[PDB]
Amino acid sequence: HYTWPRVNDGADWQQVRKADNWQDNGYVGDVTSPQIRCFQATPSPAPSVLNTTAGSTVTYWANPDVYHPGPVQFYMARVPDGEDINSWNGDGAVWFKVYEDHPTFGAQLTWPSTGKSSFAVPIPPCIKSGYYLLRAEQIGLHVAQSVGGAQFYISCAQLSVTGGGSTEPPNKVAFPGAYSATDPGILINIYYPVPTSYQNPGPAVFSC
Ligand SMILES: *[C@@H]1O[C@H](CO)[C@@H](O)[C@H](O)[C@H]1NC(C)=O
Ligand SMILES: [Mg+2]
Numbered sequence: 001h002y003t004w005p006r007v008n009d010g011a012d013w014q015q016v017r018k019a020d021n022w023q024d025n026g027y028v029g030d031v032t033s034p035q036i037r038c039f040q041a042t043p044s045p046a047p048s049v050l051n052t053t054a055g056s057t058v059t060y061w062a063n064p065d066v067y068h069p070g071p072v073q074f075y076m077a078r079v080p081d082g083e084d085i086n087s088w089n090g091d092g093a094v095w096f097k098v099y100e101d102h103p104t105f106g107a108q109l110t111w112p113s114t115g116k117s118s119f120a121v122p123i124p125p126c127i128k129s130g131y132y133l134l135r136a137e138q139i140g141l142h143v144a145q146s147v148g149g150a151q152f153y154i155s156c157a158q159l160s161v162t163g164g165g166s167t168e169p170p171n172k173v174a175f176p177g178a179y180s181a182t183d184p185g186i187l188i189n190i191y192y193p194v195p196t197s198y199q200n201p202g203p204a205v206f207s208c
Contacts, residue, residue, distance in 0.1 A: 001026065002064060002067070003019060003063045004061070005022070005063050007059060015046050015158055016046055016156065017040055017045060018040070019038070020041055027153055028152040031179040031180065038154065038155065039152075039154040039155055045085070045086035049085060051160045053123070054161050054163050058121045060157065064117065066153075068140030068151065069114065070113075070142075071102070071113070071138070071185070072099070073100045073138075073201075073202065074100075074121045075135040076096060076098050076134050076159075077095045077132060077172075078131070078132055085131040090175070093174045093177065095175060096171075097202055097203050097204065098124060099122060101113060103198050106194075108191075108194060123159075123161060124207070127165060128168070129162050130164070131159065132159040133157070133158065134157040135154065135156045137152060137154050138153045139185075139201070145189040149187070150188075178202050185200050185201040
């Protein structure tokens with residue numbers, strides 16, 4: 001139970017759209033729900049936008065910290081030139097993955113997110129300048145052995161990216177759309193037999 005309330009030095013939900021779990025630190029359990037995108041049943045803009053450059057790092061904060069076992073992933077989606085970040089919600093197949101982590105394998109799986117509040121998100125240097133939504137996700141897998149058991153902790157930040165390139169990420173995905181409840185990284189027993197591989201849900205990480 002954690003929120004993703006802040007980016008860089010900003011306050012709770014300042015550059016981050018106010019997630020539906022802002023009070024209860026709850027989760028999304030339905031990968032087909034509109035909440036799977038930005039944890040908002042009804043889209044509502046953040047009051048501010050974070051300025052950053054392509055190639056820089058954005059810090060995404062979890063609160064209190066990430067403590068359920070499972071992967072952290074970040075996605076981005078570009079607002080079209082003729083659109084306002086405050087009213088654009090990332091409909092359709094517009095999302096590309098910019099970060100994912102992987103567990104280490106042994107008698108038990110260890111996760112490179114556990115106990116952390118601060119997460120380094122690489123903004124790709126080669127993507128087009130413009131406004132973006134940045135989606136934060138952690139997938140709690142501690143009760144994910146049953147269908148609908150995975151717990152998604154999500155939010156989306158509003159970015160203005162400058163100094164970009166011209167590379168368009170291929171195979172963009174939709175939320176909902178990208179995930180199925182039976183995906184091997186979503187419907188999974190992490191405890192027995194302990195996995196020796198782990199397949200992150202969604203498309204491949206985009207790289208320049
Ligand atoms: C962010 O960039 C915008 C232009 O899109 C500018 O008006 C604004 O002052 C900048 N904000 C900060 C905090 O630098
Ligand atoms: Mg919890």
